[PDB]
Amino acid sequence: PSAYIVLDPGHGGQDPGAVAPDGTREADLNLAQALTLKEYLVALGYRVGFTRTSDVYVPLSERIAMARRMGARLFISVHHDTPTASRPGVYYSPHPGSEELARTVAAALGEGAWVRPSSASRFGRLYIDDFPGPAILVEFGPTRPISRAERIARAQAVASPIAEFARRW
Ligand code: NA
Ligand SMILES: [Zn+2]
């Protein structure tokens, strides 16, 4: 397993992440969104790997270790927010280049997009902070049913800025 960019679908298996009132699991939206994004990054000429490709829980430290073993330079975690979230955004690690990558991705996520350091999260840290490279956690808006066409639109939006970051950094 070798890859320049690693996609990390948040949660999985026994960890559903956020659950919509209709039962949509963040974990399933995450995997679906990451699978679609991989197709866009491969089309732009990048070797893409995953921390998970199925509905199984991968320990947070193993997500980071797998990325390092694959020789990843960029770590992109894929999440959806609580079902009442209004605005997409990006958390960035304190590692050099993370904030730059987050801002270029946030610029593609439309009106009201935010960026925050991992230190602004509930416990003041995120697992992405262990990755020795640019590392972000994208919250693609609220946990709710998401169509194929919306997944493709989001993938196309963020693929270009990720690929342009990877080319320049
Ligand atoms: Na862990
Ligand atoms: Zn999440």
Author numbering: 7 to 175
Please share excerpts from the published article on this structure.
Here, the detailed functional and structural characterization of Thermus parvatiensis prophage peptidoglycan lytic amidase AmiP, a globular Amidase_3 type lytic enzyme adapted to high temperatures is presented. Endolysins can be divided into three groups (i) peptidases that cleave the amide bonds between amino acids; (ii) glycosidases capable of hydrolysing glycosidic linkage; and (iii) amidases cleaving the amide bond between N‐acetylmuramic acid and L‐alanine at the N‐terminal portion of the stem peptide in peptidoglycan mesh (Vermassen et al., 2019). The here presented AmiP constitutes the most thermoactive and ultrathermostable Amidase_3 type lytic enzyme biochemically characterized with a temperature optimum at 85°C. The extraordinary high melting temperature T m 102.6°C confirms fold stability up to approximately 100°C. Furthermore, AmiP is shown to be more active over the alkaline pH range with pH optimum at pH 8.5 and tolerates NaCl up to 300 mM with the activity optimum at 25 mM NaCl. The functional characterization of AmiP demonstrates high efficiency of catalytic activity and broad substrate specificity toward thermophilic and mesophilic bacteria strains containing Orn‐type or DAP‐type peptidoglycan.
Diffraction data were collected to a resolution of 1.79 Å and the structure was refined to a final R work 0.185 and R free 0.225. The structure solution by single‐wavelength anomalous diffraction revealed five independent AmiP molecules in the crystallographic asymmetric unit. The domain consists of a mixed α/β fold with a central six‐stranded β‐sheet surrounded by four α‐helices and nine loops. Helices α1, α3 and C‐terminal helix α4 shield the rear side of the β‐sheet, while helix α2 partly covers the β‐sheet front side. The active site is located in the shallow cavity of the upper end of an extensive recessed cleft defined by loops l1, l5, l8, and helix α2 across the β‐sheet. The Zn2+ ion in the catalytic site is coordinated by His17Nε2 (AmiP (B) 2.18 Å), His85Nδ1 (AmiP (B) 2.15 Å) and Glu32Oε2 (AmiP (B) 2.06 Å). One glycerol molecule (GOL) originating from the crystallization conditions serves as a bidentate ligand completing the Zn2+ ion distorted trigonal bipyramidal coordination geometry. Glu145 acting as catalytic residue located in strand β6 is oriented in proximity to the coordinated Zn2+ ion. Compared to these structures AmiP adopts a distinct compact organization achieved by omission of a helix α4′ and shortening of helix α3 as well as all β‐strands and loop l5. AmiP's compactness confirms a trait associated with adaptation to high temperatures as it was shown before that hyperthermophilic proteins are usually shorter than mesophilic homologues (Walden et al., 2004).
